[PDB]
Amino acid sequence: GNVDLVFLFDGSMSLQPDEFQKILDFMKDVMKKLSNTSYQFAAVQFSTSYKTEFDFSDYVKWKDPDALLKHVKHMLLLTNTFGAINYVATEVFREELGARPDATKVLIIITDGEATDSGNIDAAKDIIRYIIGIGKHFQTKESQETLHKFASKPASEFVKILDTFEKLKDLFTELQKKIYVI
Ligand SMILES: CC[C@H](C)C(=O)O[C@H]1C[C@@H](C)C=C2C=C[C@H](C)[C@H](CC[C@@H]3C[C@H](CC(=O)NC)N(Cc4ccc(O)c(OC)c4)C(=O)O3)[C@H]21
Ligand SMILES: [Mg+2]
């Protein structure tokens, strides 16, 4: 059917400029690959605060991933992931901003650290949640486990741990092998 996908991307101060850019490039690559399909996209940057960089109605109107992410500015603050998930669930998946009432709701969280806030994400229960944890902060098994609370079940399928930012390329390769005409 229809899929309404939101990229929720980390803009924290731990990210070097080239690392932030690789996150952007990954999102653009996925959008370009899936252009003119059944998929619709929205992108939200999160750090201490949250900002919708473009919503579903923007994507439908302009279509161009490069133009849609052209004026993103790296926030450079903390990682309030609990707050960001709640933000998306109540402020982005809304019919007024172009969300389709009959689409499947998907959230892709891209982060390089553990959350600096706390709370619950009960508001996002109906949303399918993928988490991609990248880098040094996720070496220990204990740090990886913290991400499980954000992801859909089972974690083994919805949590992806990449050791370097270069590995987003490999993830994109993997995704492309699962594309089919149905
Ligand atoms: C597909 C492998 C790829 C590496 C991956 O995980 O892609 C994820 C994360 C990230 C890399 C980017 C992505 C971009 C677009 C779609 C939403 C990817 C996930 C696709 C899956 C597809 C899939 C539904 C389906 O098979 N459609 C025909 N589901 C539900 C689901 C999830 C896990 C399952 O084991 C499952 O069993 C049938 C069904 C989903 O929730 O989304 C997503
Ligand atoms: Mg960080």
Swiss-Prot record:
Sites carrying sugar chains: 36
Tissues where this protein is expressed: Leukocytes.
Subcellular location: Cell membrane
VWFA domain residues: 4-175
Species the sequence originates in: Homo sapiens
Summary of subunit composition and partner proteins: Heterodimer of an alpha and a beta subunit. The ITGAL alpha subunit associates with the ITGB2 beta subunit. Interacts with THBD. Interacts with CD226. (Microbial infection) Interacts with SARS-CoV Orf7a protein.
Annotated domain remarks: The integrin I-domain (insert) is a VWFA domain. Integrins with I-domains do not undergo protease cleavage. The I-domain is necessary and sufficient for interaction with ICAM1 and F11R.
Name this polypeptide is given: Integrin alpha-L
Part of the intact protein present: 153 to 334 of 1170
